[PDB]
Amino acid sequence: TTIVGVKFNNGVVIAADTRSTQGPIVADKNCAKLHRISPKIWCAGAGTAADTEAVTQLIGSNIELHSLYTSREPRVVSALQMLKQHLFKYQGHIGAYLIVAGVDPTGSHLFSIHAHGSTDVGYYLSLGSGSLAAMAVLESHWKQDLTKEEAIKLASDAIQAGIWNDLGSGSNVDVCVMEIGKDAEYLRNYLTPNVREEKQKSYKFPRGTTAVLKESIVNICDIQEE
Amino acid sequence: TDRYSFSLTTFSPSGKLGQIDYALTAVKQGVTSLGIKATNGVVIATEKKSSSPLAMSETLSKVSLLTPDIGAVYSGMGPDYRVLVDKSRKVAHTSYKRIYGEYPPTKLLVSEVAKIMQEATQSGGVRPFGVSLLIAGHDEFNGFSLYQVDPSGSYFPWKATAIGKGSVAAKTFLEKRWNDELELEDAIHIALLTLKESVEGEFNGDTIELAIIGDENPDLLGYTGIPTDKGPRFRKLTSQEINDRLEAL
Amino acid sequence: EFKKLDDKPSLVDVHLLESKVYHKLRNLAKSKASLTAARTAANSIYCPTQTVAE
Amino acid sequence: GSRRYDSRTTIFSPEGRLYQVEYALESISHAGTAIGIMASDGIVLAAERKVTSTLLEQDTSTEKLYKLNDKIAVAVAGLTADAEILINTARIHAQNYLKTYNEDIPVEILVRRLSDIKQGYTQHGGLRPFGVSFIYAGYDDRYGYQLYTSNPSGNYTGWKAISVGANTSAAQTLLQMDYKDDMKVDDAIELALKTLSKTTDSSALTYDRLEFATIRKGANDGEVYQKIFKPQEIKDILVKTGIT
Amino acid sequence: SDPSSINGGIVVAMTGKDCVAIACDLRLGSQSLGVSNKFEKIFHYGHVFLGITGLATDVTTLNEMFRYKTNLYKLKEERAIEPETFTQLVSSSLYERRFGPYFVGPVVAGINSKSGKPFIAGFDLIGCIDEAKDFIVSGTASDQLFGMCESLYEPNLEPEDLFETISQALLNAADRDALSGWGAVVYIIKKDEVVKRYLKMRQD
Amino acid sequence: YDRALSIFSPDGHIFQVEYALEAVKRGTCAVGVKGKNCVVLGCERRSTLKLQDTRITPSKVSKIDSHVVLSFSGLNADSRILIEKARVEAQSHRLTLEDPVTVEYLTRYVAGVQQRYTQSGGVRPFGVSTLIAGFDPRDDEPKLYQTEPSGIYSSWSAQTIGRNSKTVREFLEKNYDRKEPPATVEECVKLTVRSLLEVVQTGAKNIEITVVKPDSDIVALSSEEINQYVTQIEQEK
Amino acid sequence: GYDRHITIFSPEGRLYQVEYAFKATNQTNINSLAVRGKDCTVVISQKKVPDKLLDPTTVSYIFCISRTIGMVVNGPIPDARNAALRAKAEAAEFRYKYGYDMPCDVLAKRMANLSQIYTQRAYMRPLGVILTFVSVDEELGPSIYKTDPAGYYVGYKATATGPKQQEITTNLENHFKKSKIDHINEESWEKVVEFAITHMIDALGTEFSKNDLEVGVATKDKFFTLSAENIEERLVAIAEQ
């Protein structure tokens, strides 16, 4: 995957794709990799899938406790800090690449983190494999301060250029628009560029086209009755 | 040096563990709280009190959220609940939200907090928490449940129960007022009316703390466009809302 | 028949009505007696309020 | 300092006898009756709760009956709080045996392990022992059905029929007259209920205050089915045996 | 060379509609020698079925590990484990050994028995939760399977049809795989009954 | 924890060791008598009680080694801890030195378990005394030792511990000679039955006899065997 | 026996050891008065120094635990210092791990929880100090949270502490009864100091000096204290009211 984040005045949008890879092998057609640190703090994961998911889950617990002690919504910066330290004590052994986006009563923010513990600021941040491709689209057509109507289109177009010029990205574009004063709208499958075209045959066969040596019932659907 | 490892809680020659009996006295000195299980929600309620008129009771919580679907309420000592609520949230995460990725069942959570009680009556330097907790909740495998956590280190499920100084009278109130089918709306009206007799001061919605583990609220979900997830089943009622239910008595 | 099945707020009312009938028959020995029966079956003050008023 | 507030809790008396264990046996006599009867086709565990109320939900409660493993369940008589620790230790230990030998734990091994913990607490640390007595129903291949009682000192003794908790003497004496080795699980169910009706801890014995569980080899292919009966399935058997 | 490809073997899992089916081969050897055709790879807990591929030591050590945990759930809750909480549990316990990682690919296959809903998930190494509801493929000949699997499959099947597809996918992958071709088992997993069907397979 | 549960007394004693010995007095009686070709440990069982299955009930004699048996008097909770530690130690000797343990080695080992908690604080001593008996490998010499919770051990030609140990011991002064043990296995067995029939009585139900014969031959003589021996002694007397 | 000598429960269910802690915070005879302004929180406290040979400048009871959050202590000064040290350490820690400075609410709760732990332990003595935490937070406005030796705390409109604090309560109660709001409607922080001094004179009957007062003011996003020169400007300004 690739992650775009667009900070603008009204909120922040975060967009990433659903194509799962395990090496040049495509493991999954669909599998979302947008994770929730908090209800209002959505991140998405790139790099290794298991290193993103495993630490959003873990700090996901910590930030929830933190929220229950303050009895107020968590800050965005809190999430970044929790991650920074955790990555640093392994010395960048963990391969989490997260873009942390969020609304909270302080306002919209957008940050990124790299595996080693580096944290960057921005109004447009991009990361992952199709970073390079997503960035290109962005810098011509962008101006500072945009609406969500303008931005969701813009975000989305950039993830496309990750599909058609990078192979590490692909399939459907999923988007979470976290607005000020509203709950965050996870608009999953905003764009489906491509589906699998329907073939001309069914490969449904009568019984016996498979060779069978015996059969026997084995049940666990009961624990044995008297 | 330290040599406190001799248990403070020990058997007496007439049987019983003496220290927890002492601690149970403190529960019947505390505020009164009650919980009625409806067939369409649970209501838990307690009374807010203050030692100063310049104290704010909107900065005072005695019903707290452990997980979005399981709330707790105490009677007993203020300090002892204050520490133990944090530990309840913490063990709910370590033992089911990092292992099974979700909030624990109501049965599971109650058991774990009873172990924390148990080991605060084991070994020296630790005396029990002098609270009894009603832990009402909802899980998806056994529906609504209402529990009562003892300072003993045991629990009991109930159909409706009360704890605190006015518990004995309050449970006799609920005995005629409980039935096989109940509504959550009428459960609230019973709970307030019973707690009227256990409050000696004001009876406003600002001084009566009410919370339901009713049904999900998708405006407290914090996100939309996932229909799979259901919002917080718990919902603490603001003072104005409680005043409406006082007029509905 | 429902002496066996007496715990009901509905069967308090039976005893009250019985009092109201012995009243109008002008004997207040058995009205009193059946007031006293109603009282036992509402040892409770948690029987419906309308009943209590009666 | 530290030694000031200690009284030397766990020590011998001039008789040789451990104060806390003597005290512990008193507190188990407070707790309700639990009876175990070993039939030649199962083990019946039947316990009368120490709490009952019309507001107490007893229809989901399994406060005395707990399964340690698939072939070994216990009935509890003593402190429920104290028992909870040993119950989860037992689950860990049985699973540990299964992990390492890929064979189900015999009843002897599991009971011995728990017993060692209870002895250990009076031996060192100044800890109070667990004031509980358990009756273990268990199946194993080697000795078949095995019945065991454990006491709070940390010692286990085999039996054929035995009672712990409240009314141990009264229950035992009735069992001596009625027990036979030709009894089946059917006969043992009837005996258990009758004994509890004569050793009742109030003035009534009811289904809703009865917890009841068997372990029966009447499940097909010589397999053992642990069944913990619901109170309305207890109610069915309550009319069968003519208690009601 | 890598621990996973020394002991190899393949597992396919496919959803039906109101059924699922998981299949594996019984071949398990070291290097080129096939040892046994007496070890199956598929285990089960309540109604969830687990096939697990990769390094043999860690197959059998995680067999016991999974078993241990789902014993704790069964006795504690007094209800069986759901296929979706078996997934998180599988993931967590892989990622505890982050360092010296496990060298397997667990495949979770079951039917959530409280919606009748079919459920499959995949895994490799330390975690990574693979959501599909078509098919999940695993093992060293995961590439042979992935090809076969997409082409044959059609959304929604009856159990009777599901036996032909999932078998056919295992059949041609296993004998174009060096480390499979001795034995095979296919479990057709209904929520009313489980029929286990041994396959005849040509010698590899 | 290290707060004394064993502390020196102005009597030159520790109170708990004295108490420990009274705990063994209240225990059941174990008798040990060794022949010229056997050791015999017969012990009182509390199997008088009805509704008891004795198959699954612990025995009062537990083998620690192939040729080393251990009997005990005092608390039954305490004794099992000694029996488990003793066994682990026995297999360790086979691991690093080879050969099974000698009887003398085990006698010293159990004694050293009692010893440790007598001196240290935060621990009480056990209330359990043992009769450790057996053979050494490639030896037909019977060994009969007694260890006690003091941390002392002593060898004996014959000995008895538990309840009414004085009474049994007095009987053994006339029925056992230091110069001449029982010549045969059978006369040793019947002498141990005869000693038990003083205090224990009450059939062969509560009477147990374990015989160990040279180099790892352990046979336990069932109640039926004991009944025959009892009847012969009764008739003769 | 030891139900009053350590922190174990009594037959009464009341911890006597804990009660004794509150019976030592009023024996230092320091009164405090803390009011919430419309943009500030002001706390004034006694600073009675009866000696020529004690330097009055170093006699203090207002310790800055954060740059924005002051803390005023009523009760013994050894326990004050320990509670200040611990609070400062935690406030710093909160910045470090959560990326923003510790709120007044949570700093109060954290000391509250440690107080419970100190009365859980039977060899640890609780810190016998009543701590008032004054701030202006941006998510809670002008705030007062007052923790006590047991481990109980709550928010406040206004609060007082000391032996004579009942008199202070009377003044505050009238003020917020008439205004019908939980704070003083005064938009200059200096005049909230002037008001506070007036009610201190009313309550205790004592005429104050600049060397009997010590004033802490939390405005928005900073905490400062007035020096005795600045406090004298306020005392002159009472005459100009």
XYZ file of N, CA, C and O in Angstrom, chain A residues 62 66 68-70 72-73 75 77-78 81-82 85 105-106, chain G residues 94-100 103 105-106 109-110 138-140:
120
model
N -3.575 1.506 24.897
C -3.013 2.562 25.768
C -3.660 3.928 25.729
O -3.661 4.692 26.693
N -5.849 6.127 28.486
C -5.484 7.496 28.589
C -6.798 8.382 28.491
O -6.969 9.282 29.284
N -9.845 7.324 29.078
C -10.712 7.002 30.232
C -10.163 7.663 31.452
O -10.899 7.842 32.408
N -8.875 8.185 31.461
C -8.398 8.899 32.666
C -8.676 10.376 32.628
O -8.642 11.029 33.676
N -8.858 10.889 31.413
C -8.984 12.319 31.198
C -10.430 12.618 31.058
O -10.863 13.745 31.171
N -12.096 12.688 28.231
C -12.092 13.686 27.164
C -11.491 12.940 25.937
O -10.965 11.814 26.118
N -11.604 13.463 24.688
C -11.102 12.835 23.473
C -9.615 12.935 23.523
O -8.915 13.822 24.093
N -5.581 13.431 22.272
C -4.949 14.196 21.292
C -4.254 13.307 20.283
O -3.909 12.188 20.628
N -1.212 14.005 18.903
C 0.150 14.035 19.209
C 0.535 12.941 20.218
O 1.703 12.560 20.233
N -0.450 12.484 20.996
C -0.323 11.472 21.952
C -0.028 10.227 21.298
O 0.866 9.567 21.816
N 3.680 10.019 19.810
C 4.619 9.891 20.856
C 4.693 8.488 21.401
O 5.776 8.012 21.651
N 3.528 7.822 21.548
C 3.422 6.479 22.032
C 4.213 5.586 21.056
O 5.006 4.710 21.385
N 8.528 6.120 20.692
C 9.340 5.552 21.780
C 9.438 4.119 21.627
O 10.479 3.525 21.779
N -10.491 18.183 19.899
C -10.960 19.591 20.167
C -9.793 20.593 19.965
O -10.130 21.787 20.037
N -8.545 20.098 19.637
C -7.502 21.068 19.344
C -7.463 21.408 17.865
O -7.168 22.550 17.528
N 4.313 13.128 31.797
C 3.110 13.172 31.007
C 3.395 13.836 29.685
O 2.977 13.341 28.643
N 4.181 14.942 29.700
C 4.709 15.601 28.520
C 5.501 14.649 27.655
O 5.369 14.642 26.435
N 6.331 13.801 28.300
C 7.253 12.900 27.664
C 6.546 11.781 26.927
O 7.006 11.386 25.860
N 5.454 11.214 27.498
C 4.839 10.027 26.943
C 3.543 10.279 26.219
O 3.071 9.388 25.513
N 2.927 11.471 26.373
C 1.633 11.763 25.787
C 1.728 13.003 24.952
O 0.781 13.347 24.248
N 2.866 13.725 25.007
C 3.146 14.784 24.068
C 2.491 16.087 24.438
O 2.508 17.023 23.640
N 1.858 16.171 25.633
C 1.394 17.432 26.158
C 1.434 17.327 27.657
O 1.377 16.233 28.216
N -2.802 17.622 32.638
C -3.906 18.438 33.119
C -3.987 18.476 34.617
O -3.487 17.560 35.265
N -6.723 18.180 36.440
C -7.637 17.114 36.781
C -6.906 15.824 37.053
O -7.159 15.156 38.054
N -5.938 15.483 36.176
C -5.346 14.170 36.121
C -4.186 14.142 37.073
O -3.886 13.105 37.653
N -5.735 13.479 40.317
C -6.133 12.092 40.352
C -4.963 11.180 40.597
O -5.112 10.116 41.190
N -3.761 11.575 40.127
C -2.574 10.769 40.203
C -2.036 10.785 41.602
O -1.637 9.746 42.121
N -7.055 24.784 29.110
C -7.686 25.292 27.919
C -8.850 24.406 27.562
O -9.610 24.729 26.651
N -9.077 23.328 28.351
C -10.085 22.333 28.079
C -10.979 22.217 29.280
O -11.898 21.399 29.283
N -10.791 23.092 30.296
C -11.479 22.990 31.563
C -11.599 24.391 32.106
O -12.300 24.611 33.092
